[PDB]
Amino acid sequence: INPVNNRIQDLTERSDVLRGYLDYDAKKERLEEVNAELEQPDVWNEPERAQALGKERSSLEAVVDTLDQMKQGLEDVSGLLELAVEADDEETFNEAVAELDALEEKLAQLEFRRMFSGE
RNA sequence: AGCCAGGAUGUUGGCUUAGAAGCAGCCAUCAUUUAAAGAAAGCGUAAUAGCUCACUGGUCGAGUCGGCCUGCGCGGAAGAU
Ligand SMILES: [Mg+2]
Structure with missing residues (x-):
């Protein structure tokens, strides 16, 4: 879970x-x-x-x-994580762990796009 | 052949595009209500919209269609005393 935890904040930071x-x-x-x-x-x-x-x-x-979306998606992810923490259920936790990746990927893509402006 | 009527639905097929709604393209070119209606042949647009067309139902009420073989003609065909 520690890696997952690390990933939530880091992603947010990079978005910022x-x-x-x-x-x-x-x-x-x-x-x-x-x-x-x-x-x-x-x-x-x-x-x-x-x-x-x-x-x-x-x-x-x-x-x-x-x-x-990034701002909002991240928030949603955080909420999910919180929910998981509150209610000791594995599936929810798993979901929380997973969903974040996609957002991160999207962010990365966006960054790449920004970088390579020229034709 | 004209003439009168429809020429629908899923649907604006998605996409990539700036937008794409038959009609910029790229691609699939399918199915429905069935009399019949192309994921559309042309016009049209910002794009829709809009206007035709394909096929089909009526009216009408006898011939009609476009290939082949050959005859003769037509155009293509402008010059300097
Ligand atoms: Mg001759």
Whole structure:
């Protein structure tokens, strides 16, 4: 269990680091304005511009959305772990141990993507 | 051959894409209500939407379709006293 324990916190830390690197607030802000623009119906009259806007939005959402998921997913995992601890059941514990890996992998992938920006 | 009607459902098939809803592609090209309805032949769009088409049901009420063999013609075919 000690390794599992180590993995929960470490993952969180790395997520935090990633977020910091991103400087996510700016991105969020951009998304917001972009979202607002999209909501306004006059943007779609000019097609190319609209398309561009759409392109801009999704990525912004997704990076930010990914981050959100990580934040939330991690929390969920923690909760699960807590539950397991409280109720001495093996299956739950096992689940707690396992589910975290996927999130970590996702995070890693995201980081990799961030790294290799050039075409 | 025209003419009148439908030209549905799962479904907007997923994806990758910025979006993809027959129609950017890439791929499967299946099944349903059955009279019949292509996971779609063309137009159309931001993409849907929208407008046709395929096949099929009515009207009508006799011939009709496009290959082959050969005859004769047509275009292709502009020049300097
Ligand atoms: Mg001749």
